[PDB]
Design a protein around this ligand. Structure first.
Ligand SMILES: CC(=O)N[C@@H]1[C@@H](O)[C@H](O)[C@@H](CO)O[C@H]1O
Ligand SMILES: CC(=O)N[C@@H]1[C@@H](O)[C@H](O)[C@@H](CO)O[C@H]1O
Ligand SMILES: *[C@@H]1O[C@H](CO)[C@@H](O)[C@H](O)[C@H]1NC(C)=O
Ligand SMILES: *[C@@H]1O[C@H](CO)[C@@H](O)[C@H](O)[C@H]1NC(C)=O
Ligand SMILES: *[C@@H]1O[C@H](CO)[C@@H](O)[C@H](O)[C@H]1NC(C)=O
Ligand SMILES: *[C@@H]1O[C@H](CO)[C@@H](O)[C@H](O)[C@H]1NC(C)=O
Lengths: 729, 49, 49
C-alpha cells in the first residue's frame, strides 16, 4: 500500500520583511502530521516556530517570514519537528538567514563630461520585488579620485522611490573617472561613475574595416577603408591596405626583415560613400605554420597633403583552430527515460557551415552510431540508445580522440575543434524518473508555455495505486514562486512517455526559471531533477513614447508623448543618440536593471553554512549490515537524487532518501574617445495622467543626428516602466 | 582657514566642499603644530631659529 | 557466477552503500581450509571480481 511520506522542502536562504514561500509534501495517509520548523535554540526565543497543518495529497504552500536577524547573516540549526501524536523526527540544519536590504540604483546621462558644465544625475529605489520604495538614506556623495568627496548631500528622502539632482563641476578636474557613493543604514553600497576631460574635438578621422576571423578556404574578401574628416564627408584621395605575415612572437635579435608574407592593394578613394576594396584569401596563402598577418592601412589625401596614419585592426586574429564547431543544446541532464536531444552546429569564419555536410555522430560506450548532416533550417537533433552504466561520453568529429599524438614537442600542434561531451547519470536506484528537455529557445512573454516532459516507470509500478502524484515546483533565486499539482492514472506494467505540464510567464522570477518536477512514490523514494528555462525581459508597466514627427530645425514647438500605466513618477531624458551610438548603454536598460539585482541564485551550500547531522556523520558506522559492505555516508554523485535539491538551493527533512553532510567522511577520485556636442537636450520630471501626459518637447536646433530618450517610469500602480528604445531622426 | 565661516552663511555655496576643506584642515592644524616654534613664533618649517 | 557490482536495484535506505569487502576468513575458504571443493546453492557470494 505505502508508507508515510513527508518532505518539507525549505530554501535556507531567507529574506527579511518580504515574502518567501514555504511548502510541504504529505501523502499515503496515516494518523496525524502537524510538522513545525523551529530554529533550535537553548530556549524557545529565536525559534521561528512555524507549525504548518499537514494533510495528505495537498500543496497549500505557506509564505512564512522572519523578523530582522541579530547580525547581517547567521547560522541557526533548524529542525522540522514532525509533530505526530506518537512519532517525532528531528534533523537539524543551519539556516542561511540574511538581513537582505532593499535595492537601489543610480542613473546618469553620460559618463564622459566636458569641464565646466553642470552634471545632473538621478538615483532610484525599489525592494525585493520590482516596485518603487521610498526610503531614507544615511548619505550620498560624489567622489574625486584623490580620496575626497567632490559632492555630498545629507539624509534626503525620496519623493517617489527616487530623486534627481544637478551638481556643478570645475573646469580643471583630474581628467578621469569620478565616482558616486551611497551607503544604506545597514551599509549597502552602490556605484555609478562619470569621466571628465577637456578632450579636443578633432576635425579628422579615419576608419578601416576588415573581417576579424577568416578560415583557410575562402574565395574572396572585402575591406572598407576610408578617411573622412568628420565621419560624414566622403573625401577623395588614395588609400592602400597592406597586410603582412611578419611573425608569431618575433624577437628581432635575428634582425631579419620580420615580414614573412605581404599583400599590397591600392585604390583611389570614392567621392560618394566611403571607399571599398576587394582582396582574395588565396594570395595570402594563410598557411598553418605561417604567421601573424597584421591588418593595417595607409591613407594619403590629395589636394591637402596632411597625411595622418592609423593602425586599425593592426593586431590580427590567429585562428589556431580551423573549421571550429561547437555545441548548441547539449542536454543539461541525460536520462534513459526519453531519448535526450543534445545539439551541435558548426561556425566558421563568416559563420556559415558547409551546406549539408555529413557529420560523424558517435556517442561512444553506448555504441549508437548514426551519422547525420546539418540541415539548412535544422541542426542535428539526434539521440543514442544507451544500454549501459552511468559512465557515458559523446563527441562528433570523432575520426579519433586525439589527432595522432606521436609528439608535438611544444613546437606547434594541429588542433581543430571537436565537440566532445562527458555526461553522468541520475542516481535513481528506482530507475524511474521524468526527463525534461530544455526550453532553450525564444520565449515571448505574457502567455503560458506547456513544457514537454516524458517519463518512465521501470518494472511498472510495483504496487502503486490507481493514482500516483507528480507535482512540479519552480524555485526562484532562493525561494519558490508558484504551485502546481498534476497526476495521471498510472498503467501498472507498461511504459508511457507523455506527461502534460504548463506554467504562465509574466514577470517576478529569477533570470532562470528553475522548474523542478518529482515522482512521489509509495515506497519511500522520490525521483525528479532540475528544469531550467530562460526568462526573457518583459516588464510590468509597458510604456511607449511618441514625438511630433521629425522635421526641420527651427520648429522649437514639438511633443514628447508618453503613454504608460495611468500613474507614475517618470524621468524624461530626451537626449542625443550620438552619445549612445558611440557607446552602447550596457549600464542602463530593462535587462540591465533585471541583472543588476544581486544574489542571482545562492545555489547549493553557501560558505557560511555550518555542517549538520545527527548520526550519519559518525565515521566508521561499521557493523551489522546485510550487504557485502557498508560504504560512504554521502549521497555523492554529479546528479544524485539529493544533488537535485542541492542544485535547487533548498534542503529537506525526509523519510525517503535525501540528505548528506559536507564535513564528514567522503572518498575522492571514485585612451581617447571620439566626440561630438555633449550638450544635453531634455531634463525634467513629470507625473503621468491617465490619458498619457503629452509634454511639449523643445527642439534643440543646429544639431542633426540620431536622438534618443532615456526615459524611466517608476510607479506603485504598475511597477517600473521603461521605453527601452524608440527612434527620433 | 575661513572656509569654516562659509558653510551655512552663504545659502548658495556648495558646503560639501568646505566640509571637505575642514577635513583637510584636520591635517592642516597638525602641520601648524609642526610649523610652530617652541618660543611661540611661526615660520615655514618651525624651530632652530 | 556472481560479481561484486551486480544487483543494480535499490540502495540502503539511510546512505548509499557502494561495493567493497573484508579481509577476514570466509566461508568458501572453509571448503578450502578443509582442503577440497564443492558445488552449492547456499551462499558463498563474496569478492570474485
Ligand atoms: C495509519 C498509521 O498511522 N500508520 C502508521 C503508524 O502506525 C506508524 O506509527 C507511523 C510511523 O511509521 O506511520 C503511519
Ligand atoms: C518567547 C518566550 O517566551 N521566550 C523568552 C521570553 O520568556 C522572555 O521574556 C524574552 C525576553 O527577551 O525572551 C524570550
Ligand atoms: C566583395 O568582394 C567580392 C569579390 O570581389 C565582390 O563580389 C563584392 O561585390 C565585394 N563587395 C564590396 C562591397 O566590395
Ligand atoms: C548514414 O546513416 C544512414 C541512415 O541509416 C545510412 O543509410 C548511411 O549509409 C549512413 N552514411 C554513411 C556514412 O554511410
Ligand atoms: C532506448 O530507447 C528505448 C525507446 O526506443 C527505451 O525504451 C530504452 O529504455 C532506451 N534504452 C534502453 C534500451 O534501455
Ligand atoms: C547661517 O547663516 C545665516 C546667514 O546667512 C545666519 O543668519 C545663521 O545664524 C547661520 N546659522 C544658522 C543658525 O542657520
Amino acid at each position: 500500500s505505502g508508507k508515510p511520506q513527508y518532505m518539507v522542502l525549505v530554501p535556507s536562504l531567507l529574506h527579511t520583511e518580504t515574502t518567501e514561500k514555504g511548502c510541504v509534501l504529505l501523502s499515503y495517509l496515516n494518523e496525524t502530521v502537524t510538522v513545525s520548523a523551529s530554529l533550535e535554540s537553548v530556549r524557545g526565543n529565536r525559534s521561528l516556530f512555524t507549525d504548518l497543518e499537514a494533510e495528505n495529497d495537498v500543496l497549500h504552500c505557506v509564505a512564512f517570514a522572519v523578523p530582522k536577524s541579530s547580525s547581517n547573516e547567521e547560522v541557526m540549526f533548524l529542525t522540522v519537528q514532525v509533530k505526530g501524536p506518537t512519532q517525532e523526527f528531528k534533523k537539524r540544519t543551519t539556516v542561511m538567514v540574511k538581513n537582505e536590504d532593499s535595492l537601489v540604483f543610480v542613473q546618469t546621462d553620460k559618463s564622459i563630461y566636458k569641464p565646466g558644465q553642470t552634471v545632473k544625475f538621478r538615483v532610484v529605489s525599489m525592494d525585493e520585488n520590482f516596485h518603487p520604495l521610498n526610503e531614507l538614506i544615511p548619505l550620498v556623495y560624489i567622489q574625486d579620485p584623490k580620496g575626497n568627496r567632490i559632492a555630498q548631500w545629507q539624509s534626503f528622502q525620496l519623493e517617489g522611490g527616487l530623486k534627481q539632482f544637478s551638481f556643478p563641476l570645475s573646469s580643471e578636474p583630474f581628467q578621469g573617472s569620478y565616482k558616486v557613493v551611497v551607503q544604506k543604514k545597514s551599509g549597502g553600497r552602490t556605484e555609478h561613475p562619470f569621466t571628465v576631460e577637456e578632450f579636443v574635438l578633432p576635425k579628422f578621422e579615419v576608419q578601416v574595416t576588415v573581417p576579424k576571423i577568416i578560415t583557410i578556404l575562402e574565395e574572396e574578401m572585402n575591406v572598407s577603408v576610408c578617411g573622412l574628416y568628420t565621419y560624414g564627408k566622403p573625401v577623395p584621395g588614395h588609400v592602400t591596405v597592406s597586410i603582412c605575415r611578419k611573425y608569431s612572437d618575433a624577437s628581432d635579435c635575428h634582425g631579419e626583415d620580420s615580414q614573412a608574407f605581404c599583400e599590397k592593394f591600392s585604390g583611389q578613394l570614392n567621392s560618394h560613400g566611403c571607399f571599398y576594396q576587394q582582396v582574395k584569401t588565396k594570395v595570402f596563402q594563410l598557411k598553418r605554420k605561417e604567421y601573424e598577418m597584421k591588418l593595417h592601412t595607409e591613407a594619403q589625401i590629395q589636394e591637402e597633403g596632411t597625411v595622418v596614419e592609423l593602425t586599425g585592426r593592426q593586431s590580427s586574429e590567429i585562428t589556431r583552430t580551423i573549421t571550429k564547431l561547437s555545441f548548441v543544446k547539449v542536454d543539461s541532464h541525460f536520462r534513459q527515460g526519453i531519448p535526450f536531444f543534445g545539439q551541435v552546429r558548426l561556425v566558421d569564419g563568416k559563420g556559415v557551415p558547409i551546406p549539408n555536410k555529413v557529420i560523424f555522430i558517435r556517442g561512444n560506450e553506448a555504441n549508437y552510431y548514426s551519422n547525420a548532416t546539418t540541415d539548412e533550417h535544422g541542426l542535428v537533433q539526434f539521440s543514442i540508445n544507451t544500454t549501459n552504466v552511468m559512465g557515458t561520453s559523446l563527441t562528433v568529429r570523432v575520426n579519433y580522440k586525439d589527432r595522432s599524438p606521436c609528439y608535438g614537442y611544444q613546437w606547434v600542434s594541429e588542433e581543430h575543434e571537436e565537440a566532445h561531451h562527458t555526461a553522468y547519470l541520475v542516481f535513481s536506484p528506482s530507475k524511474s524518473f521524468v526527463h525534461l528537455e530544455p526550453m532553450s529557445h525564444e520565449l515571448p512573454c505574457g502567455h503560458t508555455q506547456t513544457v514537454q516532459a516524458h517519463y518512465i516507470l521501470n518494472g511498472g509500478t510495483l504496487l502503486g495505486l490507481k493514482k500516483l502524484s507528480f507535482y512540479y515546483l519552480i524555485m526562484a533565486k532562493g525561494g519558490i514562486v508558484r504551485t502546481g499539482t498534476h497526476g495521471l492514472l498510472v498503467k501498472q506494467e507498461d511504459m508511457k512517455g507523455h506527461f502534460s505540464i504548463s506554467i504562465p510567464v509574466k514577470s517576478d522570477i529569477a533570470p532562470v526559471a528553475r522548474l523542478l518536477i518529482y515522482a512521489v512514490l509509495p515506497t519511500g523514494d522520490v525521483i525528479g531533477d532540475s528544469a531550467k528555462y530562460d526568462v526573457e525581459n518583459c516588464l510590468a508597466n509597458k510604456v511607449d513614447l511618441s514625438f511630433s514627427p521629425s522635421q526641420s530645425l527651427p520648429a522649437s514647438h514639438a511633443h514628447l508623448r508618453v503613454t504608460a500605466a495611468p500613474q507614475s513618477v517618470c524621468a524624461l531624458r530626451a537626449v542625443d543618440q550620438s552619445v549612445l551610438l558611440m557607446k552602447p548603454d550596457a549600464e542602463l536598460s530593462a535587462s540591465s536593471v533585471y541583472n543588476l539585482l544581486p544574489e542571482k541564485d545562492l545555489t547549493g551550500f553557501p560558505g557560511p553554512l555550518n555542517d549538520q547531522d545527527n548520526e550519519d556523520c559518525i565515521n566508521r558506522h561499521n557493523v551489522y549490515i546485510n550487504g557485502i559492505t557498508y560504504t560512504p555516508v554521502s549521497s555523492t554523485n554529479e546528479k544524485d537524487m539529493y544533488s537535485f535539491l542541492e542544485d535547487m538551493g533548498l534542503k529537506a527533512f525526509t523519510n525517503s532518501k535525501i540528505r548528506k553532510p559536507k564535513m564528514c567522511p567522503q572518498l575522492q577520485q571514485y585612451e581617447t574617445v571620439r566626440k561630438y556636442f555633449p550638450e544635453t537636450w531634455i531634463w525634467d520630471l513629470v507625473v503621468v495622467n491617465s490619458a498619457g501626459v503629452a509634454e511639449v518637447g523643445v527642439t534643440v536646433p543646429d544639431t542633426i543626428t540620431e536622438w534618443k530618450a532615456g526615459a524611466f517610469c517608476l510607479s506603485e500602480d504598475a511597477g517600473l516602466g521603461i521605453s527601452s528604445t524608440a527612434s527620433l531622426r | 582657514i575661513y572656509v569654516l565661516d562659509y558653510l551655512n552663511e552663504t545659502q548658495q555655496l556648495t558646503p560639501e566642499i568646505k566640509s571637505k576643506a575642514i577635513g583637510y584642515l584636520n591635517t592642516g592644524y597638525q602641520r601648524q603644530l609642526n610649523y610652530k616654534h617652541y618660543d611661540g613664533s611661526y615660520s615655514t618649517f618651525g624651530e632652530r631659529y
